[PDB]
Design a protein around this ligand. Sequence first.
Ligand SMILES: COC1=C(OC)C(=O)C(C/C=C(\C)CC/C=C(\C)CC/C=C(/C)CC/C=C(/C)CC/C=C(\C)CC/C=C(\C)CC/C=C(\C)CC/C=C(\C)CC/C=C(\C)CCC=C(C)C)=C(C)C1=O
Lengths: 99, 114, 83, 98, 70, 347, 175, 318, 115
Amino acid sequence: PFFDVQKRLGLDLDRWMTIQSAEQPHKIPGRCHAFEKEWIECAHGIGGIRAEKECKIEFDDFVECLLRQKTMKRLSAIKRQRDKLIKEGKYTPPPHHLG
Amino acid sequence: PGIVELPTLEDLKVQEVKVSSSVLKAAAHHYGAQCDKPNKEFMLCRWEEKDPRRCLEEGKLVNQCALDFFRQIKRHCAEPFTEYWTCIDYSGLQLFRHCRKQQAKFDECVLDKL
Amino acid sequence: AGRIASFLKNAWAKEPVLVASFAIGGLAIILPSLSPYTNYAIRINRATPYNYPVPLRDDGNMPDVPSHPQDPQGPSLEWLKNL
Amino acid sequence: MPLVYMNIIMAFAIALAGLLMYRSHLMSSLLCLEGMMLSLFIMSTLIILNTHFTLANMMPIILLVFAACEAALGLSLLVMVSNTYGTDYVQNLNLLQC
Amino acid sequence: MWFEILPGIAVMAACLFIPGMATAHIHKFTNGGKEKRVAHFSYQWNLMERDRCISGVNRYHVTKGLENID
Amino acid sequence: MNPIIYTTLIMTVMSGTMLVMISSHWLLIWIGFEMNLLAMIPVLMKNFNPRATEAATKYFLTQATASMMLMMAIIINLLYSGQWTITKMFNPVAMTMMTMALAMKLGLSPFHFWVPEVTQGISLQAGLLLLTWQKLAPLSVLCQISQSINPNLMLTMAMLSILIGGWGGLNQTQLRKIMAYSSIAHMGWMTAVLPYNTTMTILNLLIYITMTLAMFMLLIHSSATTTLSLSHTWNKMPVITSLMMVTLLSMGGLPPLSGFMPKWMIIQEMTKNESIIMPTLMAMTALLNLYFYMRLAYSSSLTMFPSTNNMKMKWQFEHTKQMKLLPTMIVLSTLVLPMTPALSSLN
Amino acid sequence: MTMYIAFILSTIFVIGFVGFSSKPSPIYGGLGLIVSGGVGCGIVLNFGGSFLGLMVFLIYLGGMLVVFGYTTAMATEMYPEVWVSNKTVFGAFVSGLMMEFCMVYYALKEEEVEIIFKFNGLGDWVIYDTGDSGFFSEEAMGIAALYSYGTWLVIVTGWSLLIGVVVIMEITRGN
Amino acid sequence: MFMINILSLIIPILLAVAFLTLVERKVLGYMQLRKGPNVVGPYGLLQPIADALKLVTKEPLRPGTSSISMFIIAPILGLSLALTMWVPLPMPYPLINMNLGVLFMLAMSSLAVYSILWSGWASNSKYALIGALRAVAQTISYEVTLAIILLSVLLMNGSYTLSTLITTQEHIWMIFTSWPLAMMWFISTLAETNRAPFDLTEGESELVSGFNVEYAAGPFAMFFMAEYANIIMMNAFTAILFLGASHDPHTPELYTINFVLKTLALTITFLWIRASYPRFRYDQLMHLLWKSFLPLTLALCMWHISLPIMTASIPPQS
Amino acid sequence: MNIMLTLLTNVTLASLLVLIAFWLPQLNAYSEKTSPYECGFDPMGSARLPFSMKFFLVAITFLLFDLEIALLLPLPWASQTNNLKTMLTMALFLLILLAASLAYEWTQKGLEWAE
Ligand SMILES: COC1=C(OC)C(=O)C(C/C=C(\C)CC/C=C(\C)CC/C=C(/C)CC/C=C(/C)CC/C=C(\C)CC/C=C(\C)CC/C=C(\C)CC/C=C(\C)CC/C=C(\C)CCC=C(C)C)=C(C)C1=O
């Protein structure tokens, strides 16, 4: 906040939605609750300058959980390689993954 | 950036209880009271450890205690229970509100026989 | 009294809908504070168990928390049955 | 970041491009203005639903509350420019060149 | 007279009766007698999916009572 | 417009800007901008002249486009970070989208062809309110997000503003038009120092607010809108235009007038950051701003201009309106250099 | 074929988006927005947002109705334009269709699109999450908390809309 | 077994409107001392078929100034919207068990007006544009009361699911708790479907046409069958929402019989008022809603938000 | 699946009825049968020139009021909260401003239709 009246006046106006690990209705946790919880607990009061260099892997795990960028990339490679291998005829899916 | 220690398939080969959702919905209250101890222990492991891969055995105890609950019900009140869960199953929403009479047969059966 | 009664009677003649709507609109705000069942509505909503009542580890010295659902100690809502 | 994100992000670009190329109509211009609002609402809905950001599900609603509010402002402005100048092509209001 | 109006109602009332009866009977016919299970929430759907897996024949309505376990 | 509605319409504008400077949530910041735009459009077309309608219109499409781009840049930041707090932007495209999204609200780079004629069409009263109050909100957002700002883009935003603002003002006669380009010139000055020290642009904002305020309500008192119409004020009000000299000199940064305090203090800060070529540049191109200030100074009372015989009964009557803080505003707008170290109060 | 309706629905969303962004006659622009708006509601419904999907359906339909209700009121052309009509709108239209159809071709043939951000084609069904929702829909409870957790948002939204009626009359009054 | 279900709904629906046109004149005539159609078949039981068959064999023609595309799609919009809207109606068990059935019907019913002016605008006629512009502001202003009335009543439901009305008014009819809202709900339904205290959409006395301005055999048949289907439902929706009926889970036929009877009685009332009142002028029908219906609408809304709280009767969400 | 099949069947049924509408009845038409209808005598040339109606002010407030009903739509699920006092105060607050907006719109000509 530019002029932090919420901190001074000691009431909440929007510091209840700004994060995913806040008190959600009926304690419905978000997808990446644990990932961001570690990240915020990591860089709390340390400052933005120190946060961007020290709490880096915690952010990367959290940002990955948000998008699954690498995990979906891993799945994309599994399916593509499986497709060409099955199409050529080296190996066929086992009966558990048919029914 | 590491490995994933997926448990042995053998560990995921415990007895798989086989009753339809209406059967469980009929047992409900009586199951909850007479099978709470293994149930609570398993979920506390679930909430504390936050990892089912560390709480399979507590899951197994639930299945074994669930079997004993259902093993007793067949031995003593198989017929009224069969009458009851059938009456629940007919409803599309499985409401206890429409099968009070069959419930009255069921609870008195297990009360004076189990 | 004379000023108010003349105004209410006059509005009751020309624009019955407005004086009507302002009535129920007025009552819709002031009774809910007065009526005593508002606390019951909070209790009913609070008592509804959408989530699991997650068990809390027993390290002793928790006399009020029951060990079994049928135990007498704990939040009892027999008032709902009576109400 | 699957292809549905590409579709609505690339969509918003054409809403941006569509707005920034006024050809002959204020009304059609306002259409592209409210067009932007779809992709923003739709993308926002996809985000907080995918992430289960339940408390933030109100954000698409508040977007819409302030959405039509601008939409009303645009047509109300369009009322007078068309009323006192006849049409809504955005070329006849160049009296403010000097 | 006014009773001549009634044939106008009757051929409509029967026609409007069909969708109520057809939907009610089709659901019962296609779900083995019992009403079609309604899943307004994910928990209801979870019971239905477990019913499909448990039945073996991949039919949610096909129900197994106590006799499945022993 | 009825007086009571006008007040509440203004209060909504101040509340909308205040919401921007106190909220920590990105959605609320966007809301504060939306409320600011919504309550201002009626203010511009208060008198309902034909000009004001498209003047208010050009306001609307420009800022709505800016608001929509700002919303989009917020959304991407949420997508890649899951955060609504105003700390920094974790997607470079998200930031590189907001700079222009905020710029068009400020009117700095070629996102500026709305500022001149929107000032021209609307009345002088809303012109003052447009060029001073409407800049606290977008600048406040920039100050908070000042950490994650692309210096190459932000500096170019300001450098373009100074050049165009100075160049454009040389070919303007309508006093409102010259004020808009002059304001655009000061836009670059405040925004150039933004990446380095945010305390400095606050200081330049405060000085520029006093300059634009004091200049405008002098124009209101003179009741003039073109250079020729201002010229005759020497016959009626000599002190107003004589005071207008010092404000014009101060607005050009000619020291020891207060207007030097930003231009001086800013240059000192960037040279601390090894920026030398660029600070020399705006030092050079601030002079074209000074040109049409002196031409205004020459035309107002430095050389008494031909008058009109209809001015006799004009001298027989005095102003009934009561501009306040005008005697105060001139003091801060002219002589506060001895209190320069007071910038640390902002810090 | 029912592989994943998300792309197909979003494609019609873009093609409908292309339409009114090409600057037709305003009435035909309403149709181009409505198809995109209707299918956009379909996209959100498919993602679990049942309430929000029909929500944008009801509001927008009323929103765009007064839009082209206005165009025939005082923004109508004595000879209205059409999708073909002038070569400019024809050029603006066909440009949009060929554009989007190029990106989707660029999208579905390598699945590693890197325009601006990264876009990999693997199926929007993947990003879904495994887990129940109890006896409540998550979206409905989230937007229900507006009256309990969002009392600040209600105030600013309510006041702005009330001011919204004030400006609309004040702008449109005149004289 | 779903195509059979759908075609077990579409055919009965189109046959219901089919003979509603016979029970219109045969009721309208008897209320104006006439006798109605009793020549084509016994008691007129074949007149609509004779009407329909003619209306698919007499020369259709697009207007010379029409817009072909929008002229043709408007009947598609009217008919498909009317049919698709019956889908979530909970006759014992609804065909499609939508979780938000109420919101669905509100959305699509708000869409059935795009047909009326797309037809009006494309027809390029002076009476067409007048009737189109009459209707749009007529419906949307009547839509604000439509939305709030539904919300205020459904606050006792606890959800928007249409099936829950069966459970909600299980012991007591809903009208006995919301009769003031029932009156404006019935009037609004008379207004959205354009029956004749507010049939100004057609405006035959002053606008000769407007439902179907140059529209001919086929397209005229659609724009008729698309609004007479709305007549039957908007009373079926009124019946399901206010006048509940006993529903035995084992024998749904009793509920369907009861549900049909309420729709039939309500539909007769739609025909009954149609021949007992003059025509509202445009400003009057707008004044009635914006100046008399809405103030009572909001006031009774605030009552129904507070009422469950003061009486501790918050309905179950599930 | 179920919803889209129903949507498809309706549009095919409607479109088929159009197809048999324009093809089964054969046409013997000319340029005078396609003339626009104007109750007999020749039209003066209209139906596309600006036809300015008067309820534009209340037409656009409907859009504003339709946003109010969007804001107060989630009320059925809002009652299922643990802090009804705050929910009741806010729920009535939106209704009050909705009433207040209508009342102020009423007083200043507003709903009156321009002459
Ligand atoms: C001012 O106020 C006013 C009003 O009121 C307020 C009014 O009221 C009126 C109206 C005036 C009056 C009432 C006065 C008297 C006038 C009349 C009665 C006019 C009568 C008008 C009519 C239209 C007659 C209506 C009567 C009848 C009998 C209609 C009967 C209906 C039919 C013959 C059709 C019924 C439906 C059928 C047959 C459907 C068949 C469907 C199928 C076979 C299946 C189709 C679907 C499929 C096969 C799906 C599968 C296909 C797939 C999947 C294809 C896939 C394809 C791929 C390519 C993929 C006016 C004028 C008015 O001024």
